[PDB]
């Protein structure tokens, strides 16, 4: 019993570093999300933009292939 | 040494609740990766297909529809 506090001093000490060590990983995982949460904001736009003016070329390029295609019927038939 | 022995006994019992109390937030917010980002990876692949086909569809729509059309409108000759 006399030493039984000595053993129970270390659990009062060891549990302290398990508090100390663990919160450090909680520190890291926050910016392991936030910085990535800035990366998956630019990637969508930089990827969606390179589509939003791809339909504007899939169409206007056919404008020459429809506004001028009305002329062939005048002579082909 | 009764009050000193008892003090450490109730002392440890709270820091071992923090042991769960700090691995409670960790278990939850760590699951905020395993599904939120993993599906967020899929939508990139889903949006990825459309950039494979608008090129394939326009592959015939830009070349073939102009290899012969402007050939057909060679009436200037």
């Amino acid at each position, epitope marked *: 019993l006399a030493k039984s506090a000595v053993a129970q001093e270390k659990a009062l000490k060891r549990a302290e570093e398990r508090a100390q060590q663990l919160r450090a990983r909680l520190d890291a995982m926050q910016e392991a999300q936030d910085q990535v949460r800035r990366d998956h904001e630019a990637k969508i736009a930089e*990827l969606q933009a*390179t589509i939003e*003016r791809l339909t504007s070329e899939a169409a206007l390029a056919e404008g020459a292939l429809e506004a001028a295609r009305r002329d062939r019927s005048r002579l082909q038939m | 040494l009764a009050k000193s022995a008892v003090a450490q006994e109730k002392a440890l019992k709270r820091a071992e609740e923090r042991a769960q109390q700090l691995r409670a937030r960790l278990d939850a917010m760590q699951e905020a990766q395993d599904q939120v980002r993993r599906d967020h990876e899929a939508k990139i692949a889903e949006l*990825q297909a459309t*950039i494979e086909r608008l090129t394939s569809e326009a592959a015939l729509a830009e070349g073939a529809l102009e290899a012969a059309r402007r050939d057909r409108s060679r009436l200037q000759m």
Partner: nanobody
Amino acid sequence: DSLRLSCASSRSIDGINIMRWYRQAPGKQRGMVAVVTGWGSTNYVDSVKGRFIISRDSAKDTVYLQMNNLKPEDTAVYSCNAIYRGSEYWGQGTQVTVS
């Protein structure tokens, strides 16, 4: 007898979204030849099949568009292309004449 169309880079080492090539025959406007996308997917127009080959090299950011089996029709004027920020960008290209 065996040629290549290599379009180099200046910035943005594989900041590569859709990026492509164009050719044109004199007295006419422009047209594409082959287009590749950053996902290894490659497709070709009908003509440049079996003779002209496009491939990627991200380690240098220099799209490889090999000119093989140069048939007489392959005479043309060429120029590579890319698209970043939305605003398209262009360059020179050169004149390929094989008969």
